Amino acid sequence: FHVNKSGFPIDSHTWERMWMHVAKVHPKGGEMVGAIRNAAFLAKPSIPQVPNYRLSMTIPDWLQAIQNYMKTLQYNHTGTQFFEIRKMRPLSGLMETAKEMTRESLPIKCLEAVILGIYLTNGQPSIERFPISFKTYFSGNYFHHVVLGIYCNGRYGSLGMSRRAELMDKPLTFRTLSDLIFDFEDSYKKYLHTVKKVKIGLYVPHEPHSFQPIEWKQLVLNVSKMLRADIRKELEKYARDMRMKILKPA
């Protein structure tokens, strides 16, 4: 609901709004907040080392290394996203926000994880990266979510962060893009979410100093109004276009 636009050491208006929020949602509320803010001393949390690609890792080892870093930073349940991602900025600035994430070492949410995943795979030219975004219905309201689709040596997979383990990373085992999307769909089924809309971007450039932004909306499918066979038809058509490397941004 709230996003930190004030840098690091978080300003006071943003700080108070974080706590004020969490005192409402929590049942223990004002007591649980009092216990943290007023604690005489608190343990400094360990700082995970930023993962480094070694000659002894396979591409699956590397993606698991990156993903484990993300799991260690932890998903952010505080209600205040700590790094501002302006989705439509050139990669170069997003890349700098990613560096800042590895320096400040705070919890991250879905969109921050995608930016950080691009950053940590920029040095592996055989890994292609494209965003995957979902719009979902659950019991009243709509929800948005994004992960980082991965394509490498004829297989698809993903990196990401989510409240649920089944809507983040997927091992590089899916032989088609349709198979991966349908696995997210069935993962969402387990939490009573109906997938309304699926959005797929283009491969992201590997140059960390690119002026061009991320294309998030190359293919857009209202899968709730579609039967399985027509979704697969269009994804395979689009996935063929990605790999043939012919497409111009939308």
Binding site: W15, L42, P107, R163
Partner: protein, 32 residues
């Protein structure tokens, strides 16, 4: 000078991570 800013970043980190644990344990009681 840059003394109080680095101590403040460090306490805010510790506070954020304290809070993140209690929020994570909360969101599972609700989910269950």
């Amino acid at each position: 000078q840059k003394s109080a800013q680095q101590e403040l970043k460090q306490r805010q980190r510790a506070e954020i991570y304290a809070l993140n644990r209690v929020m994570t344990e909360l969101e599972q009681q609700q989910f269950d």
